[PDB]
Amino acid sequence: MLPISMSDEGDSFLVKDSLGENKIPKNPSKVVILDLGILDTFDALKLNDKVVGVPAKNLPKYLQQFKNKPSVGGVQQVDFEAINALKPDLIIISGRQSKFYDKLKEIAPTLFVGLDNANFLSSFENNVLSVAKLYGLEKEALEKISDIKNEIEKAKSIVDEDKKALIILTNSNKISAFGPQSRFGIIHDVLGINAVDENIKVGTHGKSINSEFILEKNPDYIFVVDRNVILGNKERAQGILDNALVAKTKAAQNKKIIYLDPEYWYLASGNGLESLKTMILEIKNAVK
Numbered sequence: 001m002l003p004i005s006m007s008d009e010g011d012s013f014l015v016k017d018s019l020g021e022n023k024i025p026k027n028p029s030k031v032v033i034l035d036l037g038i039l040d041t042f043d044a045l046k047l048n049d050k051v052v053g054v055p056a057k058n059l060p061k062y063l064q065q066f067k068n069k070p071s072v073g074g075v076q077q078v079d080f081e082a083i084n085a086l087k088p089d090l091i092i093i094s095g096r097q098s099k100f101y102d103k104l105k106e107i108a109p110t111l112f113v114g115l116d117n118a119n120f121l122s123s124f125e126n127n128v129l130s131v132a133k134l135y136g137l138e139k140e141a142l143e144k145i146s147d148i149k150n151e152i153e154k155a156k157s158i159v160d161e162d163k164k165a166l167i168i169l170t171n172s173n174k175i176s177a178f179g180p181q182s183r184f185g186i187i188h189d190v191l192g193i194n195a196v197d198e199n200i201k202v203g204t205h206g207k208s209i210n211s212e213f214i215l216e217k218n219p220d221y222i223f224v225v226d227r228n229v230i231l232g233n234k235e236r237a238q239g240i241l242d243n244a245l246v247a248k249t250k251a252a253q254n255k256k257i258i259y260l261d262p263e264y265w266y267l268a269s270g271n272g273l274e275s276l277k278t279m280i281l282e283i284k285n286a287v288k
Protein backbone atom coordinates (compact mmCIF):
# COMPACT_ATOMS: atom_id res chain seq x y z
CA MET A 1 0.00 0.00 0.00
CA LEU A 2 1.18 3.52 -0.78
CA PRO A 3 2.09 5.38 2.40
CA ILE A 4 0.91 8.89 3.12
CA SER A 5 3.41 11.60 2.00
CA MET A 6 3.17 15.24 3.22
CA SER A 7 4.73 18.53 2.17
CA ASP A 8 4.70 21.46 4.59
CA GLU A 9 3.17 24.52 2.87
CA GLY A 10 3.17 26.93 5.80
CA ASP A 11 -0.56 27.22 6.67
CA SER A 12 -1.24 23.66 5.52
CA PHE A 13 0.13 20.47 4.20
CA LEU A 14 -0.03 19.04 0.70
CA VAL A 15 -0.84 15.39 1.41
CA LYS A 16 -0.74 12.25 -0.82
CA ASP A 17 -2.33 8.92 0.15
CA SER A 18 -3.36 5.66 -1.62
CA LEU A 19 -6.59 7.18 -2.99
CA GLY A 20 -5.80 10.85 -3.57
CA GLU A 21 -3.98 14.05 -3.07
CA ASN A 22 -5.49 16.68 -0.66
CA LYS A 23 -4.56 20.06 0.60
CA ILE A 24 -5.06 19.94 4.45
CA PRO A 25 -5.01 23.00 6.67
CA LYS A 26 -2.67 22.87 9.69
CA ASN A 27 -4.33 22.21 13.08
CA PRO A 28 -7.76 21.25 11.73
CA SER A 29 -10.33 22.24 14.41
CA LYS A 30 -13.45 20.22 13.38
CA VAL A 31 -12.45 16.66 12.40
CA VAL A 32 -14.89 13.97 11.49
CA ILE A 33 -13.19 10.66 12.23
CA LEU A 34 -14.77 7.46 10.59
CA ASP A 35 -11.92 5.20 11.70
CA LEU A 36 -12.34 4.30 15.44
CA GLY A 37 -8.64 3.64 15.79
CA ILE A 38 -7.82 7.20 14.72
CA LEU A 39 -10.43 8.41 17.26
CA ASP A 40 -8.47 6.93 20.14
CA THR A 41 -5.32 8.56 18.63
CA PHE A 42 -6.94 11.90 18.92
CA ASP A 43 -7.74 11.05 22.58
CA ALA A 44 -4.12 9.93 23.15
CA LEU A 45 -2.77 13.16 21.80
CA LYS A 46 -5.18 15.23 23.92
CA LEU A 47 -7.02 16.38 20.75
CA ASN A 48 -10.45 15.49 22.06
CA ASP A 49 -11.64 19.10 21.39
CA LYS A 50 -10.78 18.98 17.68
CA VAL A 51 -13.28 16.29 17.00
CA VAL A 52 -16.71 17.41 16.01
CA GLY A 53 -18.23 14.05 14.85
CA VAL A 54 -18.00 10.37 15.77
CA PRO A 55 -19.71 7.11 14.55
CA ALA A 56 -21.95 6.67 17.60
CA LYS A 57 -23.72 3.50 16.24
CA ASN A 58 -20.37 1.85 16.63
CA LEU A 59 -18.86 3.70 19.65
CA PRO A 60 -16.99 1.15 21.71
CA LYS A 61 -17.37 0.98 25.46
CA TYR A 62 -13.58 1.98 25.32
CA LEU A 63 -14.23 5.41 23.80
CA GLN A 64 -17.17 6.38 26.07
CA GLN A 65 -15.50 9.72 26.61
CA PHE A 66 -16.67 10.45 23.04
CA LYS A 67 -20.19 9.80 24.22
CA ASN A 68 -21.34 13.43 24.01
CA LYS A 69 -20.17 14.00 20.49
CA PRO A 70 -22.53 14.26 17.59
CA SER A 71 -23.03 11.13 15.58
CA VAL A 72 -22.25 10.72 11.80
CA GLY A 73 -23.69 7.14 11.90
CA GLY A 74 -21.78 3.86 11.70
CA VAL A 75 -18.90 2.69 9.41
CA GLN A 76 -20.80 1.39 6.29
CA GLN A 77 -23.95 3.27 7.30
CA VAL A 78 -22.30 6.65 7.16
CA ASP A 79 -24.79 9.52 7.32
CA PHE A 80 -23.73 12.31 4.97
CA GLU A 81 -26.31 14.83 6.25
CA ALA A 82 -24.88 14.43 9.77
CA ILE A 83 -21.40 15.11 8.36
CA ASN A 84 -22.52 18.10 6.22
CA ALA A 85 -24.25 19.71 9.28
CA LEU A 86 -21.11 19.60 11.42
CA LYS A 87 -19.04 21.40 8.68
CA PRO A 88 -15.63 19.61 9.22
CA ASP A 89 -12.20 20.98 8.09
CA LEU A 90 -11.10 17.25 7.69
CA ILE A 91 -12.66 13.76 7.18
CA ILE A 92 -10.50 10.74 8.13
CA ILE A 93 -11.41 7.30 6.68
CA SER A 94 -10.09 3.82 6.12
CA GLY A 95 -10.95 0.73 4.23
CA ARG A 96 -14.62 0.43 5.02
CA GLN A 97 -15.38 3.79 3.32
CA SER A 98 -13.00 3.70 0.38
CA LYS A 99 -15.97 3.06 -1.86
CA PHE A 100 -17.47 6.58 -0.86
CA TYR A 101 -14.22 8.56 -1.50
CA ASP A 102 -15.41 11.10 -4.06
CA LYS A 103 -18.46 11.98 -2.07
CA LEU A 104 -16.70 12.59 1.27
CA LYS A 105 -14.18 14.86 -0.34
CA GLU A 106 -17.16 16.95 -1.57
CA ILE A 107 -17.84 17.96 2.01
CA ALA A 108 -14.19 18.33 3.27
CA PRO A 109 -10.69 17.22 2.47
CA THR A 110 -10.55 13.38 2.99
CA LEU A 111 -7.46 11.56 4.39
CA PHE A 112 -7.04 7.68 3.90
CA VAL A 113 -5.40 5.84 6.78
CA GLY A 114 -6.09 2.23 5.91
CA LEU A 115 -3.81 -0.30 7.54
CA ASP A 116 -1.70 -2.53 5.27
CA ASN A 117 -2.23 -6.14 6.14
CA ALA A 118 1.19 -6.91 4.72
CA ASN A 119 3.09 -4.10 6.48
CA PHE A 120 1.01 -3.42 9.67
CA LEU A 121 3.71 -1.67 11.83
CA SER A 122 5.05 0.52 8.94
CA SER A 123 1.45 1.70 8.15
CA PHE A 124 0.33 2.14 11.76
CA GLU A 125 3.28 4.46 12.46
CA ASN A 126 2.71 6.23 9.16
CA ASN A 127 -0.94 6.85 10.03
CA VAL A 128 -0.24 8.00 13.53
CA LEU A 129 2.76 10.19 12.70
CA SER A 130 0.93 11.75 9.65
CA VAL A 131 -1.97 12.69 11.88
CA ALA A 132 0.32 14.03 14.63
CA LYS A 133 2.19 16.20 12.04
CA LEU A 134 -1.01 18.08 11.20
CA TYR A 135 -0.98 19.21 14.92
CA GLY A 136 2.76 19.58 15.51
CA LEU A 137 2.61 16.54 17.87
CA GLU A 138 5.30 14.08 16.43
CA LYS A 139 7.29 14.26 19.69
CA GLU A 140 4.36 12.87 21.63
CA ALA A 141 3.30 10.34 19.05
CA LEU A 142 6.86 9.02 18.83
CA GLU A 143 7.01 8.46 22.66
CA LYS A 144 3.70 6.61 22.38
CA ILE A 145 5.00 4.47 19.56
CA SER A 146 8.22 3.68 21.45
CA ASP A 147 6.16 2.37 24.37
CA ILE A 148 4.16 0.24 21.87
CA LYS A 149 7.41 -1.24 20.34
CA ASN A 150 8.86 -2.07 23.83
CA GLU A 151 5.59 -3.92 24.74
CA ILE A 152 5.81 -5.87 21.40
CA GLU A 153 9.38 -6.88 22.25
CA LYS A 154 8.34 -7.67 25.92
CA ALA A 155 5.42 -9.80 24.61
CA LYS A 156 7.53 -11.50 21.85
CA SER A 157 10.15 -12.72 24.43
CA ILE A 158 7.49 -14.67 26.36
CA VAL A 159 5.91 -16.45 23.30
CA ASP A 160 6.35 -20.26 23.40
CA GLU A 161 8.00 -21.16 20.03
CA ASP A 162 6.47 -24.66 20.41
CA LYS A 163 2.79 -23.49 20.31
CA LYS A 164 0.67 -22.54 17.29
CA ALA A 165 -2.56 -20.44 17.14
CA LEU A 166 -5.74 -20.30 15.11
CA ILE A 167 -7.58 -16.98 14.47
CA ILE A 168 -11.34 -17.31 13.88
CA LEU A 169 -14.36 -14.98 13.53
CA THR A 170 -17.87 -15.90 14.37
CA ASN A 171 -20.98 -14.64 12.67
CA SER A 172 -24.50 -16.20 12.70
CA ASN A 173 -23.38 -19.62 13.65
CA LYS A 174 -20.77 -19.49 10.85
CA ILE A 175 -16.99 -19.71 11.54
CA SER A 176 -14.28 -18.30 9.39
CA ALA A 177 -10.61 -18.26 9.56
CA PHE A 178 -7.71 -15.81 9.31
CA GLY A 179 -4.00 -16.26 9.31
CA PRO A 180 -0.92 -14.23 8.62
CA GLN A 181 -1.20 -10.97 6.66
CA SER A 182 -4.91 -10.72 7.37
CA ARG A 183 -6.78 -8.06 9.33
CA PHE A 184 -5.85 -9.80 12.71
CA GLY A 185 -2.33 -10.58 11.26
CA ILE A 186 -0.55 -8.73 14.12
CA ILE A 187 -0.95 -11.89 16.43
CA HIS A 188 1.26 -13.85 13.97
CA ASP A 189 3.18 -11.18 12.15
CA VAL A 190 4.08 -8.61 14.73
CA LEU A 191 3.88 -10.69 17.93
CA GLY A 192 5.44 -13.76 16.28
CA ILE A 193 2.88 -16.32 17.46
CA ASN A 194 3.07 -19.26 15.13
CA ALA A 195 0.17 -20.10 12.87
CA VAL A 196 -1.34 -23.60 12.90
CA ASP A 197 -2.10 -23.00 9.24
CA GLU A 198 0.21 -20.69 7.24
CA ASN A 199 -1.78 -21.21 4.10
CA ILE A 200 -5.16 -19.64 4.80
CA LYS A 201 -6.15 -17.29 1.94
CA VAL A 202 -6.55 -13.70 3.16
CA GLY A 203 -10.08 -12.41 2.88
CA THR A 204 -11.76 -9.39 4.49
CA HIS A 205 -14.21 -11.64 6.35
CA GLY A 206 -12.18 -14.73 6.30
CA LYS A 207 -12.58 -18.12 4.80
CA SER A 208 -15.38 -20.55 5.67
CA ILE A 209 -14.44 -23.36 8.09
CA ASN A 210 -15.95 -26.01 10.41
CA SER A 211 -15.21 -27.49 13.82
CA GLU A 212 -13.68 -30.63 12.02
CA PHE A 213 -11.04 -28.19 10.51
CA ILE A 214 -10.39 -26.86 13.91
CA LEU A 215 -9.87 -30.34 15.54
CA GLU A 216 -7.74 -31.46 12.57
CA LYS A 217 -5.38 -28.47 13.00
CA ASN A 218 -5.49 -28.80 16.84
CA PRO A 219 -4.08 -25.41 17.69
CA ASP A 220 -2.68 -24.53 21.11
CA TYR A 221 -4.49 -21.17 21.17
CA ILE A 222 -7.75 -20.21 19.55
CA PHE A 223 -8.33 -16.53 19.20
CA VAL A 224 -12.00 -15.72 18.56
CA VAL A 225 -13.42 -12.38 17.27
CA ASP A 226 -17.20 -12.25 17.70
CA ARG A 227 -18.63 -10.30 14.79
CA ASN A 228 -22.11 -10.85 16.28
CA VAL A 229 -21.54 -8.09 18.90
CA ILE A 230 -20.70 -5.34 16.41
CA LEU A 231 -23.46 -6.30 13.95
CA GLY A 232 -26.34 -6.81 16.39
CA ASN A 233 -27.21 -10.53 16.12
CA LYS A 234 -28.46 -12.87 18.93
CA GLU A 235 -25.73 -15.42 18.25
CA ARG A 236 -22.62 -15.71 20.45
CA ALA A 237 -19.26 -17.40 19.95
CA GLN A 238 -19.35 -19.14 23.31
CA GLY A 239 -22.28 -21.10 21.85
CA ILE A 240 -21.02 -22.35 18.53
CA LEU A 241 -17.48 -23.17 19.91
CA ASP A 242 -18.58 -25.46 22.72
CA ASN A 243 -18.93 -28.85 21.06
CA ALA A 244 -17.26 -32.25 21.36
CA LEU A 245 -14.95 -31.73 18.43
CA VAL A 246 -13.58 -28.40 19.64
CA ALA A 247 -13.30 -29.46 23.30
CA LYS A 248 -10.87 -32.29 22.24
CA THR A 249 -8.14 -29.79 21.19
CA LYS A 250 -5.11 -28.61 23.08
CA ALA A 251 -6.61 -25.09 23.13
CA ALA A 252 -9.97 -26.07 24.71
CA GLN A 253 -8.18 -28.58 27.00
CA ASN A 254 -5.73 -26.00 28.33
CA LYS A 255 -8.38 -23.17 28.67
CA LYS A 256 -6.82 -21.19 25.77
CA ILE A 257 -9.97 -20.40 23.78
CA ILE A 258 -9.64 -16.61 23.85
CA TYR A 259 -12.52 -14.27 23.14
CA LEU A 260 -10.73 -11.19 21.91
CA ASP A 261 -12.61 -7.90 22.24
CA PRO A 262 -14.32 -7.19 18.84
CA GLU A 263 -14.72 -3.50 19.40
CA TYR A 264 -10.94 -3.42 19.36
CA TRP A 265 -10.07 -6.25 16.92
CA TYR A 266 -12.97 -5.89 14.41
CA LEU A 267 -14.03 -2.31 14.71
CA ALA A 268 -10.83 -0.36 15.62
CA SER A 269 -8.67 -2.84 13.75
CA GLY A 270 -5.76 -1.73 16.00
CA ASN A 271 -5.28 1.51 14.05
CA GLY A 272 -4.86 3.55 17.19
CA LEU A 273 -2.42 4.45 19.89
CA GLU A 274 -4.63 3.19 22.78
CA SER A 275 -6.43 0.32 20.94
CA LEU A 276 -3.17 -1.20 19.77
CA LYS A 277 -1.46 -0.95 23.18
CA THR A 278 -4.67 -2.35 24.77
CA MET A 279 -4.58 -5.16 22.11
CA ILE A 280 -0.99 -6.17 22.54
CA LEU A 281 -1.50 -6.55 26.36
CA GLU A 282 -4.62 -8.67 25.69
CA ILE A 283 -2.58 -11.20 23.76
CA LYS A 284 0.32 -11.23 26.25
CA ASN A 285 -2.05 -11.78 29.16
CA ALA A 286 -3.67 -14.51 27.09
CA VAL A 287 -0.56 -16.62 26.26
CA LYS A 288 1.90 -15.99 29.16
Ligand SMILES: O=C(NCCCCNC(=O)c1cccc(O)c1O)c1cccc(O)c1O
Pocket residue numbers: 074075076095096204230231
Ligand atom coordinates in the same frame (compact mmCIF):
# COMPACT_ATOMS: atom_id res chain seq x y z
O1 LIG B 1 -16.46 -3.15 2.70
C1 LIG B 1 -16.75 -3.69 3.75
N1 LIG B 1 -18.05 -4.08 3.96
C2 LIG B 1 -19.10 -3.80 2.97
C3 LIG B 1 -20.47 -4.43 3.24
C4 LIG B 1 -20.89 -4.50 4.70
C5 LIG B 1 -21.33 -5.93 5.17
N2 LIG B 1 -21.10 -5.89 6.60
C6 LIG B 1 -21.86 -5.26 7.52
O2 LIG B 1 -23.05 -4.96 7.35
C7 LIG B 1 -21.06 -4.56 8.56
C8 LIG B 1 -21.56 -3.53 9.40
C9 LIG B 1 -20.66 -2.85 10.21
C10 LIG B 1 -19.28 -3.15 10.28
C11 LIG B 1 -18.76 -4.20 9.53
O3 LIG B 1 -17.47 -4.43 9.50
C12 LIG B 1 -19.62 -4.88 8.61
O4 LIG B 1 -19.11 -5.88 7.89
C13 LIG B 1 -15.63 -3.89 4.75
C14 LIG B 1 -14.31 -3.43 4.53
C15 LIG B 1 -13.30 -3.60 5.49
C16 LIG B 1 -13.54 -4.25 6.67
C17 LIG B 1 -14.81 -4.79 6.99
O5 LIG B 1 -15.22 -5.49 8.07
C18 LIG B 1 -15.89 -4.64 6.03
O6 LIG B 1 -17.16 -5.04 6.46
Ligand SMILES: [Fe+3]
Pocket residue numbers: none
Ligand atom coordinates in the same frame (compact mmCIF):
# COMPACT_ATOMS: atom_id res chain seq x y z
FE1 LIG C 1 -17.00 -6.03 8.12
